[PDB]
Amino acid sequence: MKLNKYIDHTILKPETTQEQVEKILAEAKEYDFASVCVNPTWVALAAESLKDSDVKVCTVIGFPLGANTPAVKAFETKDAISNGADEIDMVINIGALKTGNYDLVLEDIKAVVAASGDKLVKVIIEACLLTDDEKVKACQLSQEAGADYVKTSTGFSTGGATVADVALMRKTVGPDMGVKASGGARSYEDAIAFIEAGASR
Amino acid sequence: MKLNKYIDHTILKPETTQEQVEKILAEAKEYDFASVCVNPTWVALAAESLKDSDVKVCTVIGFPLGANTPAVKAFETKDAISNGADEIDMVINIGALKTGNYDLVLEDIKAVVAASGDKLVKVIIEACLLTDDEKVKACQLSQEAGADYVKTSTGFSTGGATVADVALMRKTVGPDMGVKASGGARSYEDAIAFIEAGASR
């Protein structure tokens, strides 16, 4: 129970204005959600809005395509933290993973984690573009590189979280790593199903 | 009268593998296209493949949502150029522009131009998400900030270049700034229409 703390109040559409972000922040305080998720450009604003609030400021790194260099994702992480971010969601280098360049994927995630400091890092693996072997390998690489969560989706691709995917990730990273279901409409029914599949906080 | 020089051979999908990029490079040299456009993660690979050719290495900054901070876009620009990029396509801060925060838009584009050095900068305005006033102002800001091109689209939103948009951009920036038509599904016929509408190379 207490489903409100399973909700990351998210707004990441490119056309998003300040008014809409402020509306999201207001709703987040009023309904006491776990966090707000904004693009880096709003982090500062969010940080100022939620400084007296259990609600965390979450932002996205190398988002949503994850096709940046590790140096740039690291820099964007440290910048986001300097601007007031509490959590870091990065997008895995999907292309490198599909290429079989696991060394670069690992370097990438480690680059982001190193810059993170005491802040938690979630790695969006973008499951809808992956084979099952690639999902497993993405989660293993995420755990080895020292990430705290694996996340299903950006919400900007062909599909979001599936029960099978969530269960598979949970199986892969064990019980002590976070598994977040993202992407989708998304109804509370979906959230219940994902939690039952092994999704965490 | 010779269309191959209006073509920027582009591959930016997140699932893109090394083999596909190499195929794109091979096709680009073999048919003598203007450039290849890849995400930063491939710039180096492109730079080595096209070091002996007239074909330019083009990459994308703050792509495709343009919702990064100016420091990060500048850093990514410097990183890309250090990796061998010849041209820079940045995405305008669409949200700031829709907010009316023109100061931040201008600071953003100027940051990228400053980091650009002697390399050319195109500003992707993502026209499909904009009103006509915002399109005009995006082009004006791009011009004021010292960019060399205005571009219609990222190819990752609801629509790409339209003849009307191109004509409007050309009308806005005059005859000495570049106007590039990019985006969704593009037959040579469309390219003809856009060139006649005022698109450059």
Side-chain angles (χ1 to χ4, degrees):
Chain A
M1 39 170 69
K2 271 284 184 167
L3 277 179
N4 53 315
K5 290 293 181 183
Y6 277 119
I7 287 182
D8 300 330
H9 210 23
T10 298
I11 182 172
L12 302 163
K13 293 227 268 275
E15 64 262 37
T16 293
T17 61
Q18 177 173 319
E19 280 199 359
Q20 302 176 328
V21 177
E22 291 179 341
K23 183 85 184 68
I24 285 291
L25 297 163
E27 300 172 346
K29 306 175 189 160
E30 172 183 18
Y31 297 89
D32 207 320
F33 290 144
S35 66
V36 306
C37 193
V38 296
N39 279 306
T41 184
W42 299 118
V43 168
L45 180 89
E48 179 69 19
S49 191
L50 310 170
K51 60 180 178 184
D52 299 316
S53 181
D54 286 336
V55 177
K56 298 174 304 169
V57 178
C58 178
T59 194
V60 286
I61 307 305
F63 188 91
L65 313 181
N68 317 74
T69 61
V72 167
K73 305 196 175 163
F75 183 73
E76 179 169 40
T77 304
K78 158 175 101 65
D79 178 42
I81 291 173
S82 157
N83 285 323
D86 299 298
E87 293 183 319
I88 294 292
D89 294 14
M90 71 167 289
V91 184
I92 200 169
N93 190 322
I94 305 159
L97 180 80
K98 308 272 282 179
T99 296
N101 191 356
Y102 303 133
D103 284 341
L104 171 61
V105 179
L106 187 70
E107 217 197 350
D108 196 67
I109 304 172
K110 283 193 167 171
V112 170
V113 174
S116 78
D118 63 301
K119 315 287 179 186
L120 299 177
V121 168
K122 321 196 187 61
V123 177
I124 300 167
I125 66 172
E126 196 76 287
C128 66
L129 300 175
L130 304 182
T131 69
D132 290 332
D133 289 347
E134 283 166 347
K135 292 159 205 184
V136 167
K137 188 90 179 64
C139 292
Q140 293 173 342
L141 288 178
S142 294
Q143 195 171 29
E144 178 182 351
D148 308 278
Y149 285 76
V150 283
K151 207 174 171 203
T152 64
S153 308
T154 64
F156 283 72
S157 194
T158 59
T162 80
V163 167
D165 287 344
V166 169
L168 179 59
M169 302 170 211
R170 172 58 64 193
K171 172 183 183 189
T172 299
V173 302
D176 298 342
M177 200 174 171
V179 173
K180 215 87 168 68
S182 63
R186 107 157 177 271
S187 65
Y188 62 97
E189 300 151 351
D190 290 21
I192 299 174
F194 297 147
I195 295 173
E196 287 180 4
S200 61
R201 190 55 61 85
Chain B
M1 140 166 43
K2 240 152 293 210
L3 277 179
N4 54 316
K5 293 306 214 178
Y6 282 94
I7 287 182
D8 301 330
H9 210 24
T10 297
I11 182 172
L12 302 163
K13 292 190 161 78
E15 63 262 37
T16 294
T17 60
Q18 176 174 283
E19 282 198 359
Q20 301 176 327
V21 178
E22 291 179 340
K23 183 85 185 68
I24 285 291
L25 297 163
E27 300 173 346
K29 305 175 266 180
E30 138 182 14
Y31 292 91
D32 205 1
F33 287 145
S35 66
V36 305
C37 193
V38 297
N39 279 306
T41 184
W42 298 118
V43 167
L45 181 88
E48 177 69 19
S49 191
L50 311 171
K51 63 179 179 183
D52 311 317
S53 50
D54 281 354
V55 176
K56 299 160 304 169
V57 176
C58 179
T59 195
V60 285
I61 306 305
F63 189 94
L65 314 182
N68 318 74
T69 61
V72 167
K73 305 196 175 163
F75 184 91
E76 179 170 40
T77 304
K78 157 179 99 182
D79 180 34
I81 291 173
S82 302
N83 286 323
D86 299 299
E87 297 184 329
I88 294 292
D89 295 15
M90 71 167 289
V91 184
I92 201 169
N93 190 323
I94 303 159
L97 180 79
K98 307 272 283 178
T99 296
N101 191 354
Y102 307 135
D103 285 341
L104 171 61
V105 180
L106 188 70
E107 290 172 357
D108 195 66
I109 305 171
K110 284 190 169 164
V112 169
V113 173
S116 173
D118 61 300
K119 313 286 179 186
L120 301 177
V121 167
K122 323 194 188 200
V123 178
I124 302 166
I125 66 172
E126 196 77 288
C128 67
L129 299 174
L130 304 181
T131 69
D132 289 332
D133 287 347
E134 283 165 347
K135 294 154 95 173
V136 168
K137 185 89 179 138
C139 291
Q140 293 172 342
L141 288 178
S142 295
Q143 193 172 29
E144 179 181 352
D148 308 283
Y149 286 77
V150 283
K151 288 187 62 179
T152 62
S153 307
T154 65
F156 283 73
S157 194
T158 59
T162 80
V163 167
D165 291 347
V166 169
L168 179 59
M169 302 167 52
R170 172 59 64 194
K171 174 182 215 76
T172 299
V173 302
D176 296 342
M177 201 173 171
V179 173
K180 216 87 168 68
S182 63
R186 218 69 55 186
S187 66
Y188 66 97
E189 300 178 350
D190 291 22
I192 308 314
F194 298 148
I195 294 174
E196 287 181 5
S200 302
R201 15 178 185 166

